[PDB]
């Protein structure tokens, strides 16, 4: 065991809603802006606009002179924010000496599908257009943020870019027809709602298509990727699936499924020393490929 976690979990469980209410959709965003982690106070931030979206460039110390994160946040691609993730992209640009574009993305369901793709896309183009070099440039992103990560890459090499150094997507959703096992084998251990959210991207999409839905893309020319996963979180099946498919497709990557983790354990690192943990390691993973 230990016990972090469990205090974690119980405290998690505590405020839950049920199974199956059905929350209205700005209920849902401002409960995320509510309760979202104040980014360490040696973290600075510093407002830009990108391919017409709002954004931070997001500095701890130790930021080094070439590097960059385009992250793109989690939240079920309706929801979550520049705020909602500031705490966490800060303690992964601390980890990593880079600074990170950590982008405001078109939402659904005002903007389906394929417009974070398309933002995505536009973002690290401009990372390009300001001259950061894609063998210095990174790409992360959690949850919803990490399946974009993927659905970037395969869209901007589709368009003929340069890929960029690493890229480490953490408990990514990257199909959205959620049918693994994991939501059933998986579903005590964490803390459908998931479904309706699909659907409030997809508006009606191809659910298996490769920009939406990128654990059915083709992969081959992506850059190695580090892939972090809870054992005890619905979306396990997800990244073993990325493995998979990456492995399949040429790509390196490292699956590392940290057991009793649940969805995202990084952005609870104020208090869960594994948060910290996996965070400084994400650091070393993107620190590794650049330095190669």
Known sequence: AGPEIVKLKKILREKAVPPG????????????????????DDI????????????????????????????????????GSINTHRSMVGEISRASQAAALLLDYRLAPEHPFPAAVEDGVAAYRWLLDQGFKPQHLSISGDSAGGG?????????????????????????????????DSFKTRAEADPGGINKMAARYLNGADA????????????????????????????????????????????????????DMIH?????HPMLPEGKQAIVRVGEFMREQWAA
């Not at 954004?55 to 309706?78: D, F, N, S």
Request: contains cysteine.
């Open 264 to 268: 995202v354990w990084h952005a609870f």
């Open 208 to 259: 298996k298509h490769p920009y939406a839905s990128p654990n059915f893309a083709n992969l081959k020319g992506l850059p190695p990727l580090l892939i972090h996963v809870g054992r005890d979180e619905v979306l396990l099946d997800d990244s073993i699936k990325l493995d998979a498919k990456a492995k399949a497709d040429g790509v390196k990557s490292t699956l590392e499924i940290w057991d």
């Open 148 to 180: 974009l990560v993927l659905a970037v890459l395969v869209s901007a090499r589709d368009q003929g870019l340069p890929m960029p150094a690493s890229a480490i997507p953490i408990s990514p959703w990257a199909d959205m027809t959620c049918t693994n």
């Open 44 to 79: 600075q931030v510093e407002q830009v606009t990108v391919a017409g979206c709002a954004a931070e460039w997001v500095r701890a110390p130790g930021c080094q002179a070439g590097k960059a994160i385009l992250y793109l946040h989690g939240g079920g691609y309706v929801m």
């Open 21 to 40: 209410t059905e929350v209205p959709l700005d209920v849902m965003r401002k409960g995320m802006e509510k309760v979202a982690f104040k980014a360490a």
